[PDB]
Amino acid sequence: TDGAAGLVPESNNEVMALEPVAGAALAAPVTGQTNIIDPWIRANFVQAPNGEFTVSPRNAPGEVLLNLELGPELNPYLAHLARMYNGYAGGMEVQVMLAGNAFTAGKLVFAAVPPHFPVENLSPQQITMFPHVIIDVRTLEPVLLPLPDVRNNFFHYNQKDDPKMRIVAMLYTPLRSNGSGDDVFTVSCRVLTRPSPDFDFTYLVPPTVESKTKPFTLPILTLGELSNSRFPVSIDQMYTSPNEVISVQCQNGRCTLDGELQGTTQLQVSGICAFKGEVTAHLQDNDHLYNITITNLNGSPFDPSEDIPAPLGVPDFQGRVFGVITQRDKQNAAGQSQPANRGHDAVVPTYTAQYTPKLGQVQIGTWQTDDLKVNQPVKFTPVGLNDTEHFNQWVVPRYAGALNLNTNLAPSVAPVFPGERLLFFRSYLPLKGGYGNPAIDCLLPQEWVQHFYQEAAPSMSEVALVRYINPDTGRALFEAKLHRAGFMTVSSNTSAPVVVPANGYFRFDSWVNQFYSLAPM
Amino acid sequence: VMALEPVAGAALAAPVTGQTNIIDPWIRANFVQAPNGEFTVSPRNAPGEVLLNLELGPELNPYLAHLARMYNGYAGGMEVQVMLAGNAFTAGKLVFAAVPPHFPVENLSPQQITMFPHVIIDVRTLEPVLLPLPDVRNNFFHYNQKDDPKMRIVAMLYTPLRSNVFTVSCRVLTRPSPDFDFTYLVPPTVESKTKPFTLPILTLGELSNSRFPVSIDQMYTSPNEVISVQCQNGRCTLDGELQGTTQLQVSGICAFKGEVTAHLQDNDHLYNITITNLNGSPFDPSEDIPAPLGVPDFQGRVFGVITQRDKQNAAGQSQPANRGHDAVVPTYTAQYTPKLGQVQIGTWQTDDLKVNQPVKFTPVGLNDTEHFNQWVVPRYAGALNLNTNLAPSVAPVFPGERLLFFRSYLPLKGGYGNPAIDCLLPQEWVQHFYQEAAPSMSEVALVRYINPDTGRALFEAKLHRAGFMTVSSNTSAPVVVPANGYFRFDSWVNQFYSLAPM
Amino acid sequence: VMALEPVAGAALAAPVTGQTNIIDPWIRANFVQAPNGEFTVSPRNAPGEVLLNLELGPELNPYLAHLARMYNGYAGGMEVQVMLAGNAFTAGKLVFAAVPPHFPVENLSPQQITMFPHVIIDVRTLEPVLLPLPDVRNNFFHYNQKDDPKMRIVAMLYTPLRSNGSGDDVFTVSCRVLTRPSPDFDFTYLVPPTVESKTKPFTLPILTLGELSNSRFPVSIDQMYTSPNEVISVQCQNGRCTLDGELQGTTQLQVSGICAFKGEVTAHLQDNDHLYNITITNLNGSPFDPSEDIPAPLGVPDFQGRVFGVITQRDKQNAAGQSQPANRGHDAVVPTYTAQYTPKLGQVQIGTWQTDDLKVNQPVKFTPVGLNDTEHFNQWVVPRYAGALNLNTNLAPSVAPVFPGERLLFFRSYLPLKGGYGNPAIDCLLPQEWVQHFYQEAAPSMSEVALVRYINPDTGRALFEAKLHRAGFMTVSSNTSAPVVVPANGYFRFDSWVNQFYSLAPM
Amino acid sequence: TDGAAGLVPESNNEVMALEPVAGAALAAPVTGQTNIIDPWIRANFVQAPNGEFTVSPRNAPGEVLLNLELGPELNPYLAHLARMYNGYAGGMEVQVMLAGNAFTAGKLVFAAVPPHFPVENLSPQ
Ligand SMILES: [Zn+2]
Ligand SMILES: [Zn+2]
Ligand SMILES: [Zn+2]
């Protein structure tokens, strides 16, 4: 009050033109129990899981900075309480703290959008056709907004087929500043929620049984415990994307945060860059080549009319993968009816016309060792690459050879905010011979893929804001954006190994959108 | 029929707390089954053994166990009811008593348990009986982190129970007394000591072996001459403690890395190697470990590939050179001493290795089945040294039970055979137990293998606190299952629970 | 304000205690600065950084910490006052939360600290704010002996600092925390003063660098020397004693007992040099039980090398001179890297250059001087105390600086030789006088790290600061390895107990 | 008042917790004359001979910036008057003007130390 010298506006005197809407007392004669809530949660403002957003000079006017659907997932206490109830009815109370510096100048607009109205293409003047309020970014005392639960039935259920009343923020001015120094004056804003007096839960169910109420969590695993999801080795370091790479497409190690596997991704660590089949041919060139009818990795025949580009776990890059193939006979030739065994080196070229794993054929090679039976089962175990000839890790091989197209591919991913590049997890691979130091970068570790598949929690936004925490210092090193497609982006200008301690971990902070300005590394 | 004084709740602790919260009144309506409310009574039991031991807490109710992850303390009592399931031919009686906080219950006679507040019931009954469990204490309230003793319910057989094989199934259902309340709101799901125990929902085609880096293909019951095992990779309690040479990464099992420091000559060129840790740290043999985490823990001849990348880039002018060849690590011989810090290898008639250059091992399988006995832990310091800091040996104690394994088949290089590596837990279970690290409310858990389409449980086993599973079977055979089955945590039991025959 | 209900104090404990004591009313008014109550907020910080982590108790107020050594117990809360130093052309916010006793505060999110009783204050606030720190417990009062956890109060950066700088230095908000007792704080029961342990405060002796001495060899201290780049984790066996006064390894109390042994002679051989195998007892005269939990008898050397010294012999029976026994004393060398130096088994072998004058079966006494030569001189290798056929058991743990950018701080002392070329030195962690003072005082450690400062006596200002750990070693925040150039008549002064997250000023 | 735009604190509202101490009227029955002082010197603030000190960014926190012993040499008029008297009894009144710029930020602490207490090694707490 007295600390600010009269340089900023102290309070906002403007209301939304909304009517008092009924809550859960309307739903009383048709529901079952009408449970209650602890009175400390009712009367204290707590930061929402959609809490953080920033206004920056990189933002253009007319961008949607905030889009809050009504629910019990707007409060971190109600989000834990709502996992043992069946439904709800009622509104919330939202508080926005946006007290910026005294040298900046900008304005924001908040509006109330009805249930079945589309929000995807609002102009800056269409948002003034709703009950709205205009707030500048220098106000000291925080503003209060309603969220009144307009509906046409008695209460809601935990199903996803009823649209609800939203609040929508938009940038309304360019956020200029007339400070004398060239210093960062980017405004940091917070959103704090508490339930209305007319809010209640409905009906006690078993806890943590229903979907639609599971929360998103990250596992606490350090960088030394992570594993690569494109090759069966361990993760060495993190490494930013070069200026030539702007979008990637790599069918292994891909999973959305909702828990959907895409491309040829699977869950087993041992099944990456590996296959299993039956030798059907013999080719006598300078080197020895064989044809293998591959199956799935569990022991079932591979149907080519499945909705996948390849059998799950095949190599997804151009190169020459080096490994060891082994044989075990289906019959019993000798030794108390024990089968005999052979195991030799191999090489799988994936850029040629003989690597068509969607059709069913994978052709390998062994150098000058033609000791391999026909019509016996085989298994491939990858070690690395034999040479860096024709090694490009960002080109997808043709899974049906030439004269065909790849189908059901996972989509490409790229950053969109200005000044941001991709953040990879880099492991260095062994070679058989030659000069090189190759590397394979993955989007996600394999443990995160398994965790996202087991939890199957929904996503309340498109981007999640994480931070890299050093546990021996207790101070955050950098922050990043975890996208719903399953990739991370950072705000940097170089391409270099990120030098961090290897016993640090990522911590989930908040849900943001695609206009959040990251802090520069 | 009991008679005790009325005992206060958390309203006594009002002037020394912060918030004075309340609770949902609809939780006091239904009786909900306890998370450790399963026990059986059989005519193989005798009066004198304690069949049930329930300590008072918020974990006796699945709604209070969910609410207790956002609060800090509690005080108050709970109400208990018990159901039995027996026909008219059973003939016995069973007694339930209320035992104070600091009383020793070790070898109580059945005629001494009647000197408490008690009830006695016939087994041929059809109605559930009620047990009041108050909260006697000499402090103001309880914390969720410190653990002082509390008031119990102790069950025991009272008459032999001659039944004219037939196992009576009993269940416990609890609900909170009206004087129960919590203390102080905290961030939810961040304290320990209130996290419930769960298993991952993963099918058998998604789990990998924890002793050799390959996949699991079938379950197996232990043979008759194998009565106790002691392995080092894959040892983990249900609390999250990693014992032995156990780590979390799948890609590092039976693997190591270091420097080539010496050279010997024989039929096959040899190459002595000084090893380090897998993360890249110098190994100190003054730690309390058997050996470097992840080294092989059985006696055999491990066949793999050794790769070498140089440390200077002189050849080629921008990048360093690369050498990769096969290897054998014999773990039964005299020069396999990873505790001391040296592991010797062998390549057949191939000499292209360079000394003082960093290397790496990648296991593929074995090559020869001679000296392959997978239940001997090798001498990690050679001779003239006892193995220190080993993981304890595990063995069933109930009559008729044997070990359930997770079998996986290994690739050989040459010769004849079909070897098999058996493990206790999969690697994903070890990972889950390390991340969640929920406490153990008892010593033995109870799981069931479930067909997920119909919901029917196919068989059941006993998952112990030490990290192993035992079934009740008479033969040694593969377990035949549907393709999408998994395990599910059911209850916490004691050592007197009789399993259904497999 | 923080949503907290009133909590009872020492008036709750009235019908279960016997004396009804009061204190001075002037202490209940003055605001005294907390011992670790200061922090600065910088533009480099990120949201979610913990800044205070204070805790309730009589150790906040140095008047109550002096009165607490007369009484038997206490109960009650305090009043906290937070001041800031900013101006009107700034932006940023802080949060102050109230954490219960048994709740672990370990890397909390900035969202998760809003789920406590909290206030959110801007960095522009002109007036100092007042927070309550109540005494939540599940008993009637606390005892001065039995320690139990108490309610903490935690500060955290909520929103980063936005300001424009002045020049080559950026703006910085500095904060101070002051406390005073609540009107319901009180003590319980008058006892004799300074009798009970657990109330004794930790101090350091006022001895300068010229008056102290080495703890791994009986030589005086020469200088201070930061650890090299290839030295990251040491493990010695002499000079090891925790701040609570527990002697670890083979550490004893006497200065003259370092690298010294005593016992009888049993054997004689002469392959080249004279050998004289020697059985050993303790340094007081008791037979050494080899099954003791100690790694070796207390005061044997703890490094590889060839310790050159003088061995004397005084025989039991009186041969001549009217019942006065005879004497002899020569030079010898004990090598510690060979397979003959087994003090855990009970045998130490010496070596004498061509002097066959040492009678067997008469007791001896070794007095070390220096080294034989710099051959096999590795001062950071623990010798095999049982030779071969056994490994070293029950040692002291290894110590290492875990903070990014910190090195160990040693006490360097040079050493004489018998012959040859070199300038060797023995580095120790703590002096012997610090070990003796910590053993005699036995004051408890309130935290895991203590903060000390080197003091120049004529100006009274600090030259550098270091972190004294509970295990008995010091670390400084320096990036080189060089002798520390300070005046020789300086000493250290104990400042406060800090956390494991205190960043030292760069040296 | 109005020239500073509300950018700086205008006044300090804090006292030291000291009691009223007697002066030279206590010493009357044992002394000789009890002389007096010109009333213009009594009611006007004059700069002390220890008058000037600065706070700078070169200063470390915890430095003693000011140490005033009681005497008649704290006033330039009393220091000239005191050269013809034998003794004194009583206190003084000190005024510190420290009105700095509106962009700076710092704090000072002033304390009252008894007669026979050592001041050479005070910590900030
Ligand atoms: Zn061929
Ligand atoms: Zn050779
Ligand atoms: Zn001799």
Side-chain angles (χ1 to χ4, degrees), chain A residues 282-284 288 370:
Chain A
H282 182 197
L283 297 174
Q284 193 54 14
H288 301 291
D370 64 358

Coordinates of all heavy atoms in Angstrom, one line a residue, chain A residues 282-284 288 370, ligand 1:
Chain A
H282 N 18.9 -68.9 -48.4 CA 20.3 -68.9 -48.4 C 20.8 -68.3 -49.7 O 20.5 -68.7 -50.8 CB 20.9 -70.3 -48.3 CG 22.4 -70.4 -48.2 ND1 23.1 -71.6 -48.5 CD2 23.3 -69.5 -47.9 CE1 24.4 -71.3 -48.3 NE2 24.5 -70.1 -48.0
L283 N 21.6 -67.2 -49.5 CA 22.2 -66.5 -50.7 C 23.7 -66.4 -50.5 O 24.2 -66.0 -49.5 CB 21.7 -65.0 -50.8 CG 20.2 -64.8 -51.0 CD1 19.9 -63.3 -51.0 CD2 19.7 -65.4 -52.4
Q284 N 24.4 -67.0 -51.5 CA 25.8 -67.1 -51.5 C 26.6 -66.0 -52.3 O 27.2 -66.4 -53.3 CB 26.3 -68.5 -51.9 CG 27.8 -68.7 -51.6 CD 28.2 -68.4 -50.2 OE1 27.3 -68.2 -49.3 NE2 29.5 -68.2 -49.9
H288 N 27.4 -63.9 -46.7 CA 26.3 -64.8 -46.5 C 25.0 -64.1 -46.1 O 25.0 -63.4 -45.1 CB 26.7 -65.8 -45.5 CG 27.9 -66.6 -45.8 ND1 27.9 -67.5 -46.9 CD2 29.1 -66.7 -45.3 CE1 29.1 -68.1 -47.0 NE2 29.9 -67.6 -46.0
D370 N 29.3 -69.2 -43.1 CA 28.1 -69.8 -43.5 C 27.8 -71.1 -42.7 O 27.8 -72.2 -43.3 CB 28.1 -70.1 -45.0 CG 29.1 -71.0 -45.4 OD1 29.9 -71.5 -44.6 OD2 29.2 -71.4 -46.6
Ligands
ZN1 ZN 26.3 -68.8 -47.7

